[PDB]
Amino acid sequence: MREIVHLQAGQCGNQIGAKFWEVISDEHGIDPTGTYHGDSDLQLERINVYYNEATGGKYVPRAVLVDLEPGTMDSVRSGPFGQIFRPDNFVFGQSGAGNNWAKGHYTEGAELVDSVLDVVRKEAESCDCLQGFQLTHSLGGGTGSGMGTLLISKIREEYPDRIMNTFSVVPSPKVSDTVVEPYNATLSVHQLVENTDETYCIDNEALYDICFRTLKLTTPTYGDLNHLVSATMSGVTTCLRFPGQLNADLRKLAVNMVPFPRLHFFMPGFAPLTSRGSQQYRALTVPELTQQMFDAKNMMAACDPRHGRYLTVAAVFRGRMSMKEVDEQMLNVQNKNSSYFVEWIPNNVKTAVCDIPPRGLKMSATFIGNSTAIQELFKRISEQFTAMFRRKAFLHWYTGEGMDEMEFTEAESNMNDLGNPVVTRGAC
Amino acid sequence: MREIVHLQAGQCGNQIGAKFWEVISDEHGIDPTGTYHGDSDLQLERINVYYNEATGGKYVPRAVLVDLEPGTMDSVRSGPFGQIFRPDNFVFGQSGAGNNWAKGHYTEGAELVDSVLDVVRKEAESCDCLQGFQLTHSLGGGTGSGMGTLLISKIREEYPDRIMNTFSVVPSPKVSDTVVEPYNATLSVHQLVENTDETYCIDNEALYDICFRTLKLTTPTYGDLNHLVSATMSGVTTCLRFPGQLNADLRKLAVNMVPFPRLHFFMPGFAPLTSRGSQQYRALTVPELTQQMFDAKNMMAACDPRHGRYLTVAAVFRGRMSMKEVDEQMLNVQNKNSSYFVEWIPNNVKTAVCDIPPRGLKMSATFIGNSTAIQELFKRISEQFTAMFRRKAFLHWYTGEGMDEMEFTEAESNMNDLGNPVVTRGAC
Amino acid sequence: QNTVVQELALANKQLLMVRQAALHQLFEKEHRQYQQELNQMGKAFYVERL
Amino acid sequence: NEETISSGIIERDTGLPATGFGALFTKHPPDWRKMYTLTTYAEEYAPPYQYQPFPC
Amino acid sequence: AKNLYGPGVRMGNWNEDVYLEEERMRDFLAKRDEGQLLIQKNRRLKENLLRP
Amino acid sequence: QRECISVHVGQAGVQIGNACWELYCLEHGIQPDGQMPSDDDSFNTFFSETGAGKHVPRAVFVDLEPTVIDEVRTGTYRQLFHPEQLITGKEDAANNYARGHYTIGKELIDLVLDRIRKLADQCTGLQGFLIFHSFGGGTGSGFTSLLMERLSVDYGKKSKLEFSIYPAPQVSTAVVEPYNSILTTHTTLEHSDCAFMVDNEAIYDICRRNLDIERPTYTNLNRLISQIVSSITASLRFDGALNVDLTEFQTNLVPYPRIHFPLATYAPVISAEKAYHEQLSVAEITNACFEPANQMVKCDPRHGKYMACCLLYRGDVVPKDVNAAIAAIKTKRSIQFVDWCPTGFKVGINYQPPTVVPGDLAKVQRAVCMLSNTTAIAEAWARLDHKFDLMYAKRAFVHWYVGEGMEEGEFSEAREDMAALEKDYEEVGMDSVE
Amino acid sequence: QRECISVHVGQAGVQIGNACWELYCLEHGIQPDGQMPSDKTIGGGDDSFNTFFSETGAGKHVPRAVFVDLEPTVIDEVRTGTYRQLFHPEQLITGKEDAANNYARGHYTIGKELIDLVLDRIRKLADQCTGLQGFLIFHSFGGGTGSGFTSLLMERLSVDYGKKSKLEFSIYPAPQVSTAVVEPYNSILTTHTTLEHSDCAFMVDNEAIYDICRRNLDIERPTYTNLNRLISQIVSSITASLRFDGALNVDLTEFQTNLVPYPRIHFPLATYAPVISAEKAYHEQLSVAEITNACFEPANQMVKCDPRHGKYMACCLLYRGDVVPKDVNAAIAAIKTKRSIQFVDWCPTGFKVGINYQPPTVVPGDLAKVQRAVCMLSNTTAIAEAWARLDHKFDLMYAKRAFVHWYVGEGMEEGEFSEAREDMAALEKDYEEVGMDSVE
Ligand SMILES: Nc1nc2c(ncn2[C@@H]2O[C@H](COP(=O)(O)OP(=O)(O)OP(=O)(O)O)[C@@H](O)[C@H]2O)c(=O)[nH]1
Ligand SMILES: Nc1nc2c(ncn2[C@@H]2O[C@H](COP(=O)(O)OP(=O)(O)OP(=O)(O)O)[C@@H](O)[C@H]2O)c(=O)[nH]1
Ligand SMILES: Nc1nc2c(ncn2[C@@H]2O[C@H](COP(=O)(O)OP(=O)(O)O)[C@@H](O)[C@H]2O)c(=O)[nH]1
Ligand SMILES: Nc1nc2c(ncn2[C@@H]2O[C@H](COP(=O)(O)OP(=O)(O)O)[C@@H](O)[C@H]2O)c(=O)[nH]1
């Protein structure tokens, strides 16, 4: 019996977590009052992966809602699946991050991380074999950028043998939602690289591409945009909660998904995605699932994988099916696109079959890919960082909180030492 | 999708287009206040052709209004369908018109064309696939001629891939409302030959001989006379606004209707027409519709078809009807009037039909005619121009306003060099 | 209350469609029996090119 | 309004069929939230020959 | 830019808009059938405690 | 297995295909929703199947302008058709080969080719393309010519049949229609495997005389064309005695490789309360196709030689009766063959009666589709040749074509190809003397 | 919970605040007497009104501002008008001697009789203030009160509240039009001492709003009420994301981090969209792209400075209403694509987005009822032209000792005049230093 604590900070993290708990409460059969109303015992069999049991049949999430500014976490409580969370894991403070990594990592964020650790540690012995932790946050911005990585670091040194998955909203090419995103996300990545085991870069413009020319929506809201993130983060952790053939866990995924300890930056994809007008006409089968999955069109990161070679690939399929279709489709796509796959790593796709589809769909698949194309993200953020660091701008706010120039220098050096190895594996 | 921008210049153009917007609002279902109140869902099928929207389903017409006298602007605003237009499109100017082509072209008329082109530019950039521009104006007089042809020139320079419809009222043989009508008509048609893609010459005397010989009214005013103009402007642009078998838009009409690029002056027509006493004794059917097109007492340009061979004849029907009827009827028209139809264009008739007829009518049809009969109108204007020009009369207020001697002869030479082809192709 | 108002809008539209279908059926049946009794009386409706 | 929803009768004779081609709407494709909750083991490791269920 | 067209207007992404409206009505009628929709949901207490 | 993909280009093709799928849904037993009412393999040939039981069509409704696709996707068949192949442009092609082939051809040729590929993915045997267009409007000429270039490049080993509207020799509904017809026929001569010409004059005369409809409209015209379609591609729909796929048409109809223009006619086109008064025998259905009044283009068959003709019998027809009818026909001295084709008939038998749509035609136990590649089609080509000669003698309507992407020499190339085709027709029609 | 204290200084500041709190009251549903008719509304639940209006056992929603003025009759207008019962009697601080449009009288001599009482009031409002987000300073660079009492106030608030946020909404001296002769003295000697003590200072002008009301609001004969009611719209777009909920929750501390790249350069330029006049707004689209382009059109800026004569260094957009982020993305991408918005080469990420789900509420007045709005604040180099021209005014006026005696005989030494001048020289030196592109 294996367990994941879902701890999340920031506005993006709290809203993505709210949509995730809505999605997993849907899939497991819990109505917003906290009671179990299901139809099959398969839902309740592994309910102790995300939902702690209380008296009266009340299932409370293993969530740690964290924020410095209690404006949007309070809206998470006011949300649809709001009266399900513990009041005691609503840790907060009376301040503002001000989208500052310095004022998330070296100030009142460090005053609040002790209470967050008390909550997370108190939850940690309500366990038998905890598998690990999930942090969903925004690298570009505050709160989850600095204090999220502070949580990552201190949790990593307090529990070192538990798998950490961070779903991180990276900055974006066309529009930036904060002008200090190049500072914030680079200083967050510098702490990410010697810490986290499975990162998943999620880009809002990649979400725009998926929601505009696959889903075909006119008014794509953040509800649906974080609902895709909820779908892929429910799809990665599926066999931990439902039976099947060739079950896969998160450490199972990591050892089959990372070549080297630093090269753990992925790019995900959830892809039985079909427009509402073409849903009745869709012909859901394994070959078209694999086509929609390996198309460079449905990716949640804003990097085209046709410019770089995949190192490793995982496909977590869900549904009652013959799985040689999955096997032959992996081999067929490997043979058809050989220039986009490395040759020093053979047979570099993991198949992970589960027996239960998502509630509403019929047969699904979640993609994980350690692509060389993630180098475009880091090169773009390197140009963004060095352009506004060469002139030493937007930086007195950083230095006044207790940090200096050398930490920017070390973060830049470590993030170019991210640039070197993925390039040399893309060029052998 | 496709759009048309409605420009109206001069007092005549303003009144004609205001009555046009009344007719189009009645046809589509927009009330005087602007809120859509129709009976069928298919009236809102193609509402973008003439109307842009606003907040709350309020449809504002895509019309640009200009004149030199800020009193016709107040007349249009205080009209019944007046508070529907955009108030920023009411591009007036505290100056004089003085029915002078020089004063509307080289001077204070051209001192407002920058703001007019700014409004037209924003209305054209707020589109996706613009089909073109229709301008309503008076050929004789100022403003509609003076600023009108300049507006045609600048719009043609900015957008060289759109159809220019120009609904212009030509000066009449029997009566004149301005003693410099030949001057303005020649200096306006000189620009209209090499600029606009299709004109619509609507003479007042032929417009009103309808009101005798078919309508049998006693005292019709201009509010009655511009309604036939509005009926034809509605009937031309009807297959791109309402569905029907064998559709036909403005540019398909232009390619089927303009053989040589200079020869694009048409005579209009609308022929489900009969008097109030003769309505109940009539046998409304496609053959009698075709005959009422081809009789020389219904058309709105004082040009006899028996004075010249027809080059092309377009007929855009509206109403539920059979196709063999209309095909055999226009073939029978071609065969019966064989000598008055050209031989070098076999099947010189373009046919089109549309489903819904105008309200209060069961079948209607608009008539477009390009013959050699326009040589009478152009030659009469040329004779009257050479009558007023050989004694240099009414010309010092062109020269003092800033116009020189030599391009008067250029305009007259272009008039005669447009009279030359429309008599050579009469005798092949 | 917001989703309740949305729900009243949807219920309005549903009863609109079912009422329109019933009214169309009733008007067609009324027209048929009016034509039948007029044919019994000796007259008939005028349809364009009937 | 809120007080008239029970008053508004919905089960009248439309003439259009209940479900099928014309209708006014469909009823099963709307929300088939219920999954295929039926594993491989349960599907094809079923009791092969039917047996009486059963100690002291 | 564009002209930002509304419902019923057939200019733009109207086919997916009308399929989405059909889906919304369709889910509302599913809620009608299984009787959990919000138009009653008190309406066994709302008037059964308000009976004179 | 034995499937075919239909591409419908232009408004003529779109509403002809509307009548076609109206016929097909009730022929194969599918409600216009797309769900079979249930209580076999036939459903495969034009309808793919998706999941729950719904039978989507193997068509691509492509039109450079809206409102014609919009009538379909807001009409009574809005749920049968998948919205992705209902491919619309934003600008009418406006009766121009240049505007249908060069300027707005590249904004939609990628989309239409991608959807042809997507429809051809879920198919085992590509028996052919059935392509519905006209020789009139700019879309129906230019875009189908571009589609011929691209589909000859991408699917060169497969059959492609065009079911084209020929311009009416008497009325017609355009002035540049001879331009567009001759240009698209020039550019699609080398790529069309077989072209079937149907004409509005002839369908008008058939509706007036045999269907006694004095005021027919285009839904009746496209319905009568749809009967030809469903009669010709029926032997790979149902089972019978002598089933013919499109490969027998692409083996038997064409003696000489550039002569691939047969004319196809129907029988029982009788008018619902009219044929209680004769037998509708096999002699009737064989003789009426060879009568010079049900010919679906305005060419006189006595002014020509029949080179090959395929009869496709449909319904309760015993093959003895067709053999007797062929023996009766081959003693006629007015139905004259060529001397190099002693056996000139290709018979096919299908065991199912034609299904009736609520409308004009009546359901009968016997029907045929007759495909004759007569040499009389040269007169039809020569009429439009004469029209183009008079229109081109003084450069009429040439600037709309040239200023949008034509070069001037394509008119001369089309004239040279048509003169060569006329020479080929008279050379294949001349009798052997050596 | 998340509440900020407004401070208003001078005639200009006090009737900034009168219209500002009219709009605040009709945004949160609060009656002019001090109560609310009924709760259960999005504006007045708890978390939106707690930002400005406090509570009281007898339903009284007491303000969180200070209305300080060195002279009476404006404070007396406030406590005589319709908002007499709302504002607390000590909440409106009045002096007994006008500042006489002298920075020396605003700062040095008559400031000491009132600064202790003002700090006592601000200490009280901060005592009943759980999470203090900052102080919103409303004043002018013109007359003596807003020139000098603010100059003392930023110093005292930096002494006692050093880590706190300070957002000035300053009436800058207009390029041409003016209301005084000693505005070149007062603006320079106020900015010199509040440059090191003000965290961020959005400067809104008067002639620019004059042109805005003349051109868009279609009113040829308007007053100060129509002038700064639009500034009340500005502040109601700035400090609203912490009041309501939305897609992006932008904080008061985020504005200073995203608009102030350097310690001394903290001078953004404000503008607003929908400014249309309610018989013209319903014949236009008013889409997200159009209201985004309206802010960046070089006529809708609320300070008369041309962005073409300079380069942007930061921009924040506060979208408000039924605005969608995926039209926000398209509009910002479109405004980044074209050339005349020329950003500097040391911030390709130069945009902040803050989205609120509350549509703007119309006051009974001249602005239209709209469901979309955006307030755009741009820190740009184009303000250096106005600063250099103000320095030209100061040098022409100081070269022969005009009005020096009033300042020096009041308590101020002469050397402060030379010290502020070289402070402005250093300010324009920093402005021209941050201008050119990087070449190293
Ligand atoms: N059966 C049938 N034939 C049609 C229909 N519409 C047009 N035709 C024939 O097609 C010819 C001209 O129409 P099209 O060639 O289809 O025009 P198009 O393909 O839409 O191209 P554009 O005119 O540019 O839009 C006419 O001469 C008709 O004979 C139709 O709706 N049904
Ligand atoms: N909306 C609005 N703006 C104002 C108003 N009064 C002044 N302003 C602006 O404020 C500037 C001067 O006001 P103040 O600085 O407050 O005048 P003061 O501080 O009271 O100075 P003195 O009374 O002369 O000692 C003018 O230049 C105006 O631009 C007002 O009443 N309403
Ligand atoms: N997918 C998704 N992303 C979001 C959502 N809300 C915010 N974001 C992203 O979060 C970033 C800013 O968040 P931030 O200001 O750091 O919130 P904070 O961590 O509380 O300070 C933006 O770039 C958004 O793209 C959401 O609901 N869904
Ligand atoms: N059909 C129609 N013609 C009009 C109307 N008003 C004026 N005209 C014609 O317009 C001509 C003169 O217009 P003009 O003087 O050029 O107007 P201006 O451009 O404002 O100076 C006259 O000969 C009239 O016949 C109208 O309401 N309807």
Short mmCIF file of C-alpha atoms in Angstrom, two decimals, chain G residues 97-254:
data_model
loop_
_atom_site.label_atom_id
_atom_site.label_comp_id
_atom_site.label_asym_id
_atom_site.label_seq_id
_atom_site.Cartn_x
_atom_site.Cartn_y
_atom_site.Cartn_z
CA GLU G 97 -3.71 78.19 8.05
CA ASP G 98 -3.34 77.60 4.32
CA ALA G 99 0.02 76.39 3.03
CA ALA G 100 0.01 79.38 0.59
CA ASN G 101 1.47 77.24 -2.25
CA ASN G 102 4.88 77.20 -0.56
CA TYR G 103 6.94 74.05 -0.08
CA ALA G 104 8.67 75.75 2.86
CA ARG G 105 5.33 76.24 4.61
CA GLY G 106 4.30 72.72 3.66
CA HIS G 107 7.44 71.09 5.06
CA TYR G 108 9.38 73.21 7.55
CA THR G 109 7.25 75.61 9.61
CA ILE G 110 3.55 74.73 9.64
CA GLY G 111 3.88 70.97 9.55
CA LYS G 112 4.74 70.35 13.17
CA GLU G 113 1.34 71.28 14.61
CA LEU G 114 -0.33 68.55 12.54
CA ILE G 115 2.24 65.82 11.82
CA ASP G 116 1.92 64.37 15.33
CA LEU G 117 -1.88 64.19 15.10
CA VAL G 118 -1.69 62.71 11.59
CA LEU G 119 0.80 60.06 12.73
CA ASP G 120 -1.45 59.34 15.73
CA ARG G 121 -4.40 58.77 13.38
CA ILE G 122 -2.33 56.62 11.01
CA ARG G 123 -1.01 54.65 14.01
CA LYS G 124 -4.62 54.01 15.08
CA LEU G 125 -5.75 52.91 11.60
CA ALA G 126 -2.69 50.64 11.44
CA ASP G 127 -3.49 49.24 14.90
CA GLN G 128 -6.89 48.10 13.65
CA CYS G 129 -5.28 46.71 10.52
CA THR G 130 -4.49 42.99 10.43
CA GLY G 131 -2.52 42.64 7.21
CA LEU G 132 -1.42 46.10 6.11
CA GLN G 133 -0.61 45.93 2.42
CA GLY G 134 0.44 49.55 2.03
CA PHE G 135 -0.38 53.24 1.94
CA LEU G 136 -1.95 54.87 -1.13
CA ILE G 137 -0.72 58.48 -1.17
CA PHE G 138 -2.92 60.91 -3.12
CA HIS G 139 -1.51 64.40 -3.66
CA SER G 140 -0.21 66.93 -6.17
CA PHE G 141 3.25 68.24 -7.03
CA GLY G 142 1.64 71.68 -7.10
CA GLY G 143 0.27 73.51 -4.09
CA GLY G 144 1.90 73.81 -0.70
CA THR G 145 -0.05 71.16 1.20
CA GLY G 146 0.47 68.29 -1.24
CA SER G 147 4.01 69.49 -1.93
CA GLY G 148 5.22 69.70 1.66
CA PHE G 149 3.03 67.73 4.06
CA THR G 150 3.56 64.68 1.85
CA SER G 151 7.30 65.39 1.82
CA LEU G 152 7.29 65.26 5.61
CA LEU G 153 4.85 62.32 5.64
CA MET G 154 6.96 59.96 3.51
CA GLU G 155 9.93 60.70 5.78
CA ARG G 156 7.99 59.97 8.98
CA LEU G 157 6.31 56.88 7.52
CA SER G 158 9.72 55.62 6.39
CA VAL G 159 11.08 56.20 9.90
CA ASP G 160 8.29 54.27 11.61
CA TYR G 161 7.05 51.88 8.85
CA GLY G 162 10.20 51.32 6.82
CA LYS G 163 9.37 47.98 5.18
CA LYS G 164 5.90 49.00 4.03
CA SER G 165 4.60 49.70 0.54
CA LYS G 166 3.91 53.26 -0.62
CA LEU G 167 2.03 53.92 -3.87
CA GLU G 168 1.71 57.57 -4.85
CA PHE G 169 -0.95 58.72 -7.31
CA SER G 170 0.62 62.07 -8.04
CA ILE G 171 -0.78 65.03 -9.93
CA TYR G 172 2.30 65.98 -11.98
CA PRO G 173 2.75 69.55 -13.28
CA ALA G 174 1.32 69.57 -16.77
CA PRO G 175 3.45 70.48 -19.83
CA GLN G 176 1.70 73.69 -20.78
CA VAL G 177 -1.28 74.49 -18.73
CA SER G 178 -0.41 74.89 -14.98
CA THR G 179 -2.23 76.56 -12.05
CA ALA G 180 0.66 78.45 -10.40
CA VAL G 181 4.11 79.94 -10.92
CA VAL G 182 5.89 78.15 -8.05
CA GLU G 183 4.90 74.69 -9.24
CA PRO G 184 8.45 74.38 -10.73
CA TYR G 185 9.78 75.08 -7.23
CA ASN G 186 7.36 72.83 -5.37
CA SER G 187 7.46 69.81 -7.69
CA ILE G 188 11.27 69.71 -7.79
CA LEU G 189 11.76 70.22 -4.05
CA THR G 190 9.09 67.60 -3.33
CA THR G 191 10.36 64.94 -5.73
CA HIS G 192 13.94 65.45 -4.47
CA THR G 193 13.03 64.36 -0.94
CA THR G 194 10.35 61.78 -1.80
CA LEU G 195 12.47 60.00 -4.43
CA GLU G 196 14.33 58.03 -1.76
CA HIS G 197 11.19 57.46 0.33
CA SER G 198 8.45 56.64 -2.21
CA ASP G 199 8.19 53.01 -3.29
CA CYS G 200 6.23 53.55 -6.52
CA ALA G 201 4.61 56.72 -7.86
CA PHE G 202 2.13 56.60 -10.75
CA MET G 203 1.97 60.12 -12.18
CA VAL G 204 -1.34 61.23 -13.67
CA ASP G 205 -1.61 64.65 -15.28
CA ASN G 206 -4.41 67.14 -15.92
CA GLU G 207 -4.10 68.30 -19.54
CA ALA G 208 -4.02 64.67 -20.69
CA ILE G 209 -7.30 63.90 -18.91
CA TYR G 210 -8.53 67.23 -20.33
CA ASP G 211 -7.87 65.92 -23.84
CA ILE G 212 -9.28 62.49 -22.92
CA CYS G 213 -12.55 64.01 -21.68
CA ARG G 214 -12.61 66.31 -24.72
CA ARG G 215 -12.00 63.56 -27.29
CA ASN G 216 -13.56 60.35 -25.95
CA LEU G 217 -16.10 61.42 -23.32
CA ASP G 218 -17.60 64.00 -25.75
CA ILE G 219 -17.92 66.78 -23.15
CA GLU G 220 -16.53 70.21 -24.10
CA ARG G 221 -17.31 72.03 -20.81
CA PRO G 222 -16.37 69.71 -17.86
CA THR G 223 -15.01 70.26 -14.33
CA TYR G 224 -12.75 68.69 -11.67
CA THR G 225 -15.48 66.16 -10.81
CA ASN G 226 -15.31 64.72 -14.32
CA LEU G 227 -11.53 65.20 -14.19
CA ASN G 228 -10.76 63.11 -11.12
CA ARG G 229 -13.52 60.72 -11.24
CA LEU G 230 -11.36 58.94 -13.84
CA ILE G 231 -8.53 58.79 -11.30
CA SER G 232 -11.02 57.09 -8.96
CA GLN G 233 -11.56 54.58 -11.78
CA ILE G 234 -7.76 54.17 -11.94
CA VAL G 235 -7.40 53.41 -8.25
CA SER G 236 -10.46 51.15 -8.38
CA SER G 237 -8.63 49.16 -11.05
CA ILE G 238 -5.32 49.16 -9.13
CA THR G 239 -6.53 48.06 -5.69
CA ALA G 240 -9.34 45.69 -6.65
CA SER G 241 -7.63 42.36 -7.29
CA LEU G 242 -7.15 41.95 -3.54
CA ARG G 243 -10.82 42.86 -3.06
CA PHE G 244 -12.48 40.44 -5.49
CA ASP G 245 -11.38 37.17 -7.08
CA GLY G 246 -10.11 36.57 -10.58
CA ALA G 247 -7.87 34.61 -12.90
CA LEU G 248 -4.64 36.36 -11.85
CA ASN G 249 -4.57 37.86 -8.36
CA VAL G 250 -2.16 40.80 -8.55
CA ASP G 251 -1.03 42.18 -5.21
CA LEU G 252 -0.09 45.70 -4.11
CA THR G 253 3.47 44.53 -3.45
CA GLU G 254 3.57 43.13 -6.99
#
